[PDB]
Amino acid sequence: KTRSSRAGLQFPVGRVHRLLRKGNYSERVGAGAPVYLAAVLEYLTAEILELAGNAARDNKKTRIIPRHLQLAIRNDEELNKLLGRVTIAQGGVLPNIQAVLLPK
Amino acid sequence: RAKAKTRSSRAGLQFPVGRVHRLLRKGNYSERVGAGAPVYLAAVLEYLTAEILELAGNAARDNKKTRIIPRHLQLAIRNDEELNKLLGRVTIAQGGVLPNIQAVLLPK
Amino acid sequence: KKPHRYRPGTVALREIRRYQKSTELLIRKLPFQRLVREIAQDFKTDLRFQSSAVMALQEACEAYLVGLFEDTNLCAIHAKRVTIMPKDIQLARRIRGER
Amino acid sequence: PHRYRPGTVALREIRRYQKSTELLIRKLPFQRLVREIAQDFKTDLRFQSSAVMALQEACEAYLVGLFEDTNLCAIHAKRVTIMPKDIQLARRIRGE
Amino acid sequence: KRHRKVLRDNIQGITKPAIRRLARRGGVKRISGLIYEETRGVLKVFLENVIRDAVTYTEHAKRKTVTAMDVVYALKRQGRTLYGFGG
Amino acid sequence: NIQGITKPAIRRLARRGGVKRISGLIYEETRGVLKVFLENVIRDAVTYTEHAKRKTVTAMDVVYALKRQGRTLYGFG
Amino acid sequence: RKESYSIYVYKVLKQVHPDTGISSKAMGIMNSFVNDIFERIAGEASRLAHYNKRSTITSREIQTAVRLLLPGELAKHAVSEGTKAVTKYTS
Amino acid sequence: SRKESYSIYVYKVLKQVHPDTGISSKAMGIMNSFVNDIFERIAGEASRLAHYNKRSTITSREIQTAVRLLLPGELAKHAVSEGTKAVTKYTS
């Protein structure tokens, strides 16, 4: 039986534990810490994929591509805040024209 | 036993090599620490301290003050391009700002 | 004879010189402390504060505002005005990346 | 002959280039510039292809962001044409 | 067991002349009447973020008194390193 | 080689930035800015390469250089 | 060899969008993302442990780091997921 | 209650560079904050360097590369010169 299975998670708890042990972060690691961390990472992954899927469906595409990820991130205030200083390669920018530039 | 010599003295330094070594061991930066690393680090820290104190002393004498106070440190830092770059995001408490008025605001 | 009355701007400039020469904190201690405690109370009730913590917070707040006013002034001057306006503050903060 | 008014094609280009994501500078001159600049620090360096593509993504994203801020600075002064002083103001406020 | 008067409207303690003085240090010569409310809002936002982080640190240590070190760490992790309040 | 960053390319970049009209003097200024940016990044990148005692700059070298300047890049790990 | 989160990303994707796929580049970007957030959280946790002179990183430190790192609603939901996961694991 | 600081070393350096100049308590505290800040930056950058290259030991080489990364230009060259001279004198 795996610890991820006991925890109801998809992300690999064991691997996260090994990466913490070898990442020179602290002398000891509690048993609950990698479970908590794995849960948080899985939650955030689900949030981003949710929005990116929505953006893909608006674009009538069945596969999420980087463009959809950039659109998803920049259109969500809290994710945009979290990734304010991150560049998504091949992401482009949000469609946006300043009102003063339009005629009339 | 051999007479005690300090590593700082062996290196011709003023900063405490032993203490820096202890802080590296206990700062969880790496599993192992080479014998030469704390000497180098101590030398760099001492040099930078000397540079800041040099500029601050100059500023202190320009203001006809004999004791360096925080105001002099702020003046010293902002008037040197490379230190200003290094400490671009640092606030010096009780430092104030450099005297500076935009030219367009003065009368004609 | 007519009372002595400097033209608009003279005293402002003299104040600029005066306050850039000195370093003392410019907001009153106690109202600032009350502000901090009020804001803090909306996260957890009954907190206490060390004195030096409040003094540190005050240094940080005033330094931040001073920097914001430098940038605001540069933005105002760019538009060939000499009076700073709210849109200048909003431009400065947008370019810093806070909004 | 038919002639579009000044600005219409500019707006069309804005929509066009904000819709797509392909790199906008030619690959080879960019690579040549990178190698020339690199040459002034250490001789005989080579580069992996994906390193150059990464550098290009970073450079173009940086410039795009700088142009957004520049445009905001231009509009602030009630102009519609960006000028060098606008770039210098933007860079001063970013802290470079 | 004799707590202070409930805090209200303390944003008004940031007086008009104080903001003017701060602006003077920033080199501002003339000030629109609408500046003051904007400044108050900005200051409030800044303060909120700092105090939030400070209190988070205070709770992690299971203490009830926010210390100077708590504030220094909060500021440091927001890229506004402050000198003078260590030790 | 700085002239290989042509005028129409900078125009296209500006279009993506939403710029509608562009003074003739912008282009030279832009080139200068670009050069500075590149220099800094490359200076750090080569440093990593040199630390590893390698002669080939890798993608990872660039990613680390960019990260330590607060311009984290996704996609090249 | 070269580890990635690809299979876990795919399982999550199938949970949230059964009929949606993903390009190779997008999966690479997701891996970069996960590594980034990992490093941030572990580093913040490290500072937390040092400040309080504790030698053990526990789930409580993770929780405090999460509160520092994520804004508002994201933080609350993350805390909720972490608490449920630890409670389910413990029993 | 024993709290270590760099005060005595700062004072010795001050006497080397400005024999008749003193320093206030606040300024000495600021110097301690400064020294700790640069220490943390350098040690952290060195840690990342060591990690990237799968080495378990931080040596003077990592310190030198970190120094080149953090300090600008002439400040970096002078610091590197001081460190190298100091290490070579120490080794003999």
Numbering used by the authors:
A (entry chain G): 15 to 118
B (entry chain C): 11 to 118
C (entry chain E): 36 to 134
D (entry chain A): 38 to 133
E (entry chain F): 16 to 102
F (entry chain B): 25 to 101
G (entry chain H): 33 to 123
H (entry chain D): 32 to 123
Source paper text:
Here we report the cryo-electron microscopy structures of human RAD51–nucleosome complexes, in which RAD51 forms ring and filament conformations. We found that RAD51 forms multiple conformations in the complex with the nucleosome, such as ring forms with eight (octameric), nine (nonameric) or ten (decameric) protomers, and a filament form. Notably, we found that in all RAD51–nucleosome complexes, the NLDs of RAD51 directly bind to the DNA wrapped in the nucleosome.
The decameric RAD51 form with the linker DNA binding is observed in the presence of ADP or AMP-PNP. Despite the overall structural similarity of the RAD51 promoters in the rings, a notable deviation is seen in protomer 3 of the decameric ring (with the linker DNA binding), in which the NLD orientation differs by 30° as compared with that of protomer 1, owing potentially to a unique nucleosomal DNA interaction. The sequential contacts at the 136th, 134th and 132nd base-pair positions from the distal end of the nucleosomal DNA by the L1 loops of RAD51 protomers 1, 2 and 3, respectively, are distinctive to the decameric ring. These interactions may not be observed in the octameric and nonameric rings, suggesting that the RAD51 decameric ring with the linker DNA binding could be an intermediate form for the structural transition from the ring to the filament. By contrast, in the decameric RAD51 ring, the L1 loops of protomers 7 and 8 capture the DNA near the end. In addition, as shown in Fig. 2h, the L1 loops of the RAD51 decameric ring protomers 1, 2 and 3 bind to the linker DNA proximally to the nucleosome, although they might not bind directly to the DSB site. However, the RAD51(R235D) mutant is markedly defective in both DNA binding and nucleosome binding. These results suggest that, in addition to the key role of the NLD, DNA binding by the L1 loop plays an essential part in nucleosome binding, as seen in the decameric RAD51 ring bound to the nucleosome with the linker DNA.
